[PDB]
Curated annotation (Swiss-Prot), chain D:
Disulfide bonds join C27-C35. Residues 2-37 are annotated as: Disordered. It comes from the Viruses. Changing S24N: In strain: 20A.EU2, Iota/B.1.526, Omicron/BA.1, Omicron/BA.2, Omicron/BA.2.12.1, Omicron/BA.2.75, Omicron/BA.4, Omicron/BA.5, Omicron/BQ.1.1, Omicron/XBB.1.5, Omicron/EG.5.1. Binds to host ACE2. RBD also interacts with the N-linked glycan on 'Asn-90' of ACE2. Cleavage of S generates a polybasic C-terminal sequence on S1 that binds to host Neuropilin-1 (NRP1) and Neuropilin-2 (NRP2) receptors. Interacts with host integrin alpha-5/beta-1 (ITGA5:ITGB1) and with ACE2 in complex with integrin alpha-5/beta-1 (ITGA5:ITGB1). May interact via cytoplasmic c-terminus with M protein. May interact (via N-terminus) with host bilirubin and biliverdin, thereby preventing antibody binding to the SARS-CoV-2 spike NTD via an allosteric mechanism. Residues 1-49 are annotated as: Receptor-binding motif. It comes from Severe acute respiratory syndrome coronavirus 2 (2019-nCoV). Attaches the virion to the cell membrane by interacting with host receptor, initiating the infection. The major receptor is host ACE2. When S2/S2' has been cleaved, binding to the receptor triggers direct fusion at the cell membrane. When S2/S2' has not been cleaved, binding to the receptor results in internalization of the virus by endocytosis using host TFRC and GRM2 and leading to fusion of the virion membrane with the host endosomal membrane. Alternatively, may use NRP1/NRP2 and integrin as entry receptors. This is Spike protein S1. Changing E31K: In strain: Beta/B.1.351, Eta/B.1.525, Theta/P.3, Iota/B.1.526, B.1.1.318, Gamma/P.1, Zeta/P.2 and Mu/B.1.621; May enhance affinity to human ACE2 receptor. The chain holds residues 454 to 502 of 1273 of the full protein.
Length: 213, 224, 49, 49
């Protein structure tokens, strides 16, 4: 029943010194060796310290660890915070033939201004039509803030049935991206004269329209 | 040096048997007197220790995962495999095969993490539809084109443009749950409108769970 | 008022915190007034202690 | 307020915006070398823990 208690969210500006703790509940923190792992998202974790005070060959000297055995807490001191230091931190233990990991620490970035919400509309394909399906796809990209409201329209009537939209996600150029999908029947696609998707972003509205051609 | 590579299918149905094998190149399983260990990590959660093995029959397992982890070592093939029983939807985690220098020490080398998804009901392949650009699809000197992935099960699906040759402007959106079980997403790329009728754009949608690879060409819309 | 402090065998505020003078001091100290160049109107505060 | 010269009596409000004697050097009235501002911003965010 031995678990390592770790702060879930720790934030610090670059260039300063921060301390990450790892507290054991039942067993003392000096009983077994504690290993800290720094893992980038979408990659394998990498060992950054070992034996509670020894830095492996490759990591910078700033990854310094200290043991406060009186409080049963393992400490990892980080000095000179930089951009690539933003990663998941986990502390390891062993207990008694049962390796126990830590809760996890995420270092935040503490950065983009308002961006124009480019909108693209795609009519249902001919290949989708013989499959007895139809889909209207609305595209929202290169925008900020990441809060856009979508509203489909059938000529003039708003459409809510079959509407599926995506939460905004950050792009590579620090902007956001989103999508909206409108499931429809082939008969309903040709029943209305035209369809349109309206995107509201910071008051401004960007509207495109599609027609069965 | 030494490298550890995982294999096996990326899917397993609930209440079934998992079979993932981790292979070793550049080293020997029996030599050196070290250990092997399997460690999993759910998306957005911390690392979880599954079990550790020796090149002999010595095994130890997590008491939360006891009586469900079966790991074996075959020295002839220079690899080792883990078998999991009674897998549920809460077992969706990225599985890491890490070499362990010291039993209570650190995992010096970590293999790349394969993604494992568990979800009830049968696996459903994707339906890829072309997304034809047109005059309404361009805003200025640039246009947009893409492909639609609809009614597939389960995550994930990867979309590559021109077999990965086109990466600039490619936006792969996260999936959303449809009104009836299945997922839906799209992957689009921004292109200047001058090369619309002179360049061929083919999207490569792969569904490893359903073992379906679909190549769909993207062409400008023709009025009918 | 601190030029009398540059000597071996006394305790003060500058001779013990900035430059200590030992007993075996065979130095040769020179000082003079050049207030027309190192100081200016409005308060010259460039030097510290 | 992060920086202060000395302690304060209980039930007292401190609204002084004077630059704390961080290094007690002339800094032309800004918070440069050996000068820091006592008042600092927060790090509030709705997505924290």
């Amino acid at each position: 029943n031995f678990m390592l208690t770790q702060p879930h969210s720790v934030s610090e500006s670059p260039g300063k010194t921060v301390t990450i703790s790892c507290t054991g509940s039942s067993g003392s923190i000096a009983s077994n060796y504690v290993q800290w792992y720094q893992q980038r998202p979408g990659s394998a974790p990498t060992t950054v310290i070992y034996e509670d005070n020894q830095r492996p060959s490759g990591v910078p000297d700033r990854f310094s660890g200290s043991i406060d055995s009186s409080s049963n807490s393992a400490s990892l001191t980080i000095s000179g915070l930089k951009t690539e230091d933003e990663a998941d931190y986990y502390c390891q233990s062993y207990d008694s033939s049962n390796v126990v990991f830590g809760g996890g620490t995420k270092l935040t970035v503490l950065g983009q201004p308002k961006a124009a919400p480019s909108v693209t509309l795609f009519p249902p394909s001919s290949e989708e039509l013989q499959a007895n399906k139809a889909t209207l796809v609305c595209l929202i990209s290169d925008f900020y803030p990441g809060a856009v409201t979508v509203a489909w329209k059938a000529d003039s009537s708003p459409v809510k049935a079959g509407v599926e939209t995506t939460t905004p996600s950050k792009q590579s150029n620090n902007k956001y991206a989103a999508s909206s999908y409108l499931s429809l029947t082939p008969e309903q696609w040709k029943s209305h004269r035209s369809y349109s998707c309206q995107v509201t972003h910071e008051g401004s509205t960007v509207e495109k329209t599609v027609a069965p051609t | 040096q030494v490298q550890l590579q995982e294999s096996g299918p990326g899917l397993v149905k609930p209440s079934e048997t998992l079979s993932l094998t981790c292979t070793v190149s550049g080293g020997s399983v029996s030599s050196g007197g070290y250990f092997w260990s399997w460690i999993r990590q759910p998306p957005g959660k911390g690392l979880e220790w599954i079990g550790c093995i020796y090149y002999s029959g010595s095994t130890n397992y997590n008491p939360s995962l006891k009586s469900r982890v079966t790991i074996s070592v075959d020295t002839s093939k220079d690899q080792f495999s883990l078998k999991l029983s009674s897998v549920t939807a809460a077992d969706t985690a990225v599985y890491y095969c890490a070499r362990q220098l010291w039993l209570r020490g650190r995992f010096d080398y970590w293999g790349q993490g394969t993604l494992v998804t568990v979800s009830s009901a049968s696996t459903k392949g994707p339906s890829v539809f072309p997304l034809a650009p047109s005059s309404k699809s361009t805003s200025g000197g640039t246009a947009a084109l893409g492909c639609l992935v609809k009614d597939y099960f389960p995550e994930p699906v990867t979309v590559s443009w021109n077999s990965g040759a086109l990466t600039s402007g490619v936006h792969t959106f996260p999936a959303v749950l449809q009104s009836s079980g299945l997922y839906s997403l799209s992957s689009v790329v921004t292109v200047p409108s001058s090369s619309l009728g002179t360049q061929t754009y083919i999207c490569n949608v792969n569904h490893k769970p359903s073992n379906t690879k679909v190549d769909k060409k993207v062409e400008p819309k023709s009025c009918d | 008022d601190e030029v009398r402090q540059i000597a071996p065998g006394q305790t003060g505020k500058i001779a013990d915190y900035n430059y200590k003078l030992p007993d075996d001091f065979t130095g040769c100290v020179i000082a003079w007034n050049s207030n027309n160049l190192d100081s200016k109107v409005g308060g010259n505060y460039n030097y510290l202690y | 307020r992060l920086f202060r010269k000395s302690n304060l009596k209980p039930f007292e409000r401190d609204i002084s915006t004077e630059i704390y004697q961080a290094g007690s050097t002339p800094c032309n009235g800004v918070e440069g070398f050996n000068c820091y501002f006592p008042l600092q911003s927060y790090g509030f965010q709705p997505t924290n823990g």
